[PDB]
Amino acid sequence: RTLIVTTILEEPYVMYRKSDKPLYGNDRFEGYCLDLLKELSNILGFLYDVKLVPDGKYGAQNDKGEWNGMVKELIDHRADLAVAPLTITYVREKVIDFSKPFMTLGISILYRKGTPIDSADDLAKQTKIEYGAVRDGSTMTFFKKSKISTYEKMWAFMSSRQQSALVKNSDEGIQRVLTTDYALLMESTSIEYVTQRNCNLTQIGGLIDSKGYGVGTPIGSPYRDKITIAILQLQEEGKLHMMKEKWWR
Amino acid sequence: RTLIVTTILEEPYVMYRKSDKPLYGNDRFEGYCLDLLKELSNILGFLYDVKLVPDGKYGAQNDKGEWNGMVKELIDHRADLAVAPLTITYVREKVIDFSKPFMTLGISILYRKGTPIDSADDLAKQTKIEYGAVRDGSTMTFFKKSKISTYEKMWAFMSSRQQSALVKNSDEGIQRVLTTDYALLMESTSIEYVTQRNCNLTQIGGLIDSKGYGVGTPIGSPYRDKITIAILQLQEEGKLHMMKEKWWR
Numbered sequence: 001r002t003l004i005v006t007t008i009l010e011e012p013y014v015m016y017r018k019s020d021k022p023l024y025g026n027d028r029f030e031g032y033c034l035d036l037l038k039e040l041s042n043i044l045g046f047l048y049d050v051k052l053v054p055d056g057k058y059g060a061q062n063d064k065g066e067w068n069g070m071v072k073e074l075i076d077h078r079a080d081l082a083v084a085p086l087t088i089t090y091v092r093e094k095v096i097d098f099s100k101p102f103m104t105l106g107i108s109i110l111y112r113k114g115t116p117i118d119s120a121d122d123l124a125k126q127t128k129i130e131y132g133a134v135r136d137g138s139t140m141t142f143f144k145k146s147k148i149s150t151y152e153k154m155w156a157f158m159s160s161r162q163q164s165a166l167v168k169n170s171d172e173g174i175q176r177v178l179t180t181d182y183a184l185l186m187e188s189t190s191i192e193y194v195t196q197r198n199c200n201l202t203q204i205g206g207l208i209d210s211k212g213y214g215v216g217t218p219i220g221s222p223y224r225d226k227i228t229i230a231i232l233q234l235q236e237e238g239k240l241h242m243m244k245e246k247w248w249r
Numbered sequence: 250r251t252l253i254v255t256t257i258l259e260e261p262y263v264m265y266r267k268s269d270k271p272l273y274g275n276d277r278f279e280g281y282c283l284d285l286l287k288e289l290s291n292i293l294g295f296l297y298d299v300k301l302v303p304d305g306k307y308g309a310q311n312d313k314g315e316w317n318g319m320v321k322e323l324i325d326h327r328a329d330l331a332v333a334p335l336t337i338t339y340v341r342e343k344v345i346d347f348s349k350p351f352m353t354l355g356i357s358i359l360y361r362k363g364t365p366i367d368s369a370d371d372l373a374k375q376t377k378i379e380y381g382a383v384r385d386g387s388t389m390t391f392f393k394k395s396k397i398s399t400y401e402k403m404w405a406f407m408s409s410r411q412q413s414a415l416v417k418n419s420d421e422g423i424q425r426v427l428t429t430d431y432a433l434l435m436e437s438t439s440i441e442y443v444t445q446r447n448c449n450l451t452q453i454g455g456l457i458d459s460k461g462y463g464v465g466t467p468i469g470s471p472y473r474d475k476i477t478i479a480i481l482q483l484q485e486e487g488k489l490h491m492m493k494e495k496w497w498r
């Protein structure tokens with residue numbers, strides 16, 4: 001009766017709820033994805049038990065093609081739904097089902113307000129403002145693997161000089177953006193979380209490498225179609241915009 | 250054997266191929282969506298016959314809930330696939346199947362280069378630069394129906410003064426952007442088509458009202474899952490970026 005929902009700690013999607021005493025059950029967690037799960041549970045009518053993915057991974061394959069993370073939990077039917085910022089990808093779609101994306105995003109540019117900079121075309125042709133991405137992240141992985149000429153060029157730059165233009169994590173990247181003449185390339189959702197808290201920062205340009213976060217289910221699940229419908233229903237009603245503004249403002 | 254593909258004339262997705270003699274068959278058409286259909290046909294292995302939607306409509310319901318356009322062709326099994334910029338929506342998803350989006354887009358701002366303007370927040374609080382959208386378009390329909398406070402405010406403005414801030418079509422809107430102090434709100438894809446041909450113009454800010462174009466199929470079609478996989482395959486390989494750059498540059 002009670003569906004098992006696998007998820008992953010990820011701000012502001014899933015966070016431990018702050019409390020003065022140890023909490024139990026789903027009340028331990030809060031965030032955008034917990035609110036989304038509550039709406040889904042009230043549209044389709046189901047009880048749910050949230051369980052963090054034991055290895056804290058989204059889901060990738062090792063050298064032998066063995067899966068891990070939330071994808072493996074669905075593949076092995078240890079979870080009925082994955083309600084998380086789980087990216088819809090070619091390799092994953094072949095082993096699990098995805099709903100239509102509840103959130104769409106891409107690579108954009110975090111930078112200061114009031115600067116001539118205005119696009120990815122402009123950053124690629126100057127060498128004064130140091131620009132890069134989080135080392136070993138999805139954004140960096142995109143630029144490194146890209147066959148698109150212009151993105152190969154931006155990768156050559158940010159990976160030059162011992163890769164000094166890169167940063168270890170988003171936080172260190174953020175602090176580098178505020179403290180020095182540095183422009184960060186990362187997810188538009190993450191940037192939007194930054195611009196709301198650092199009013200001296202903005203988003204420059206549009207999106208590269210579009211993608212979406214969807215709810216994952218085991219292949220053959222009856223909930224895939226149901227959840228897709230509910231997500232689009234919520235989107236049409238503006239409720240997803242409400243949820244996002246709540247946890248990002 | 251030969252699948253029937255319903256589509257719709259829409260630049261640069263589907264266009265009549267220019268010729269000095271009358272053309273026949275699929276060679277009459279060209280564009281992004283024809284190239285996408287050719288890739289799909291070579292990944293999944295099928296023959297196709299392109300047929301323009303007889304009423305030239307994407308697909309909406311009349312007062313009695315009766316469907317038209319490409320959706321009706323799929324509902325009535327007069328077409329096997331709809332390969333077109335067909336928007337994934339709640340009402341449509343209930344009567345047809347959609348693949349994962351082959352292109353994602355939203356509302357953005359077309360405007361001049363080198364201006365203090367930098368976001369939808371900035372346009373909403375000034376009354377000097379006249380800004381609006383194409384009358385009776387999806388962008389206008391979004392602002393008019395929105396319950397989000399800030400978008401209600403921008404709608405009140407652009408629909409004030411006998412709605413003078415609005416334009417009849419995109420072309421007239423474009424020419425208004427080049428000739429006067431005017432900022433246009435419309436689809437990010439359409440704006441991207443503009444910035445490539447009017448180098449004195451740029452895209453301001455991010456996306457509002459995210460959505461995606463998907464391939465439509467009749468409910469219960471075996472091609473939905475196949476096409477989703479193929480689209481993601483093409484996306485991962487960078488080929489969709491190649492196709493878009495071809496027809497937009």
Ligand SMILES: O=C(Nn1c(=O)c(=O)[nH]c2cc(C(F)(F)F)c(-n3ccnc3)cc21)c1ccccc1
Pocket residue numbers: 010011058059085086087088136137138141170187190
């Ligand atoms: O784990 C990887 N990526 N990844 C997924 O695969 C996924 O499904 N959802 C993800 C959601 C988020 C976010 F938090 F933004 F919601 C972030 N992320 C974390 C910090 N900046 C962004 C990363 C995701 C990964 C790591 C290294 C190289 C390639 C991929």
Ligand SMILES: O=C(Nn1c(=O)c(=O)[nH]c2cc(C(F)(F)F)c(-n3ccnc3)cc21)c1ccccc1
Pocket residue numbers: 259260307308334335336337385386387390419436439
């Ligand atoms: O027909 C309507 N919308 N609409 C769809 O419903 C659809 O599925 N695909 C669409 C694709 C395009 C584009 F060309 F951009 F690819 C455009 N469009 C045309 C000009 N500017 C944008 C409009 C689409 C419509 C008309 C009035 C009010 C509400 C909706």
Ligand SMILES: [Cl-]
Pocket residue numbers: none
């Ligand atoms: Cl295991």
Ligand SMILES: [Cl-]
Pocket residue numbers: 087138
């Ligand atoms: Cl990712």
Ligand SMILES: [Cl-]
Pocket residue numbers: none
């Ligand atoms: Cl009919």
Ligand SMILES: [Cl-]
Pocket residue numbers: 336387
């Ligand atoms: Cl639309």
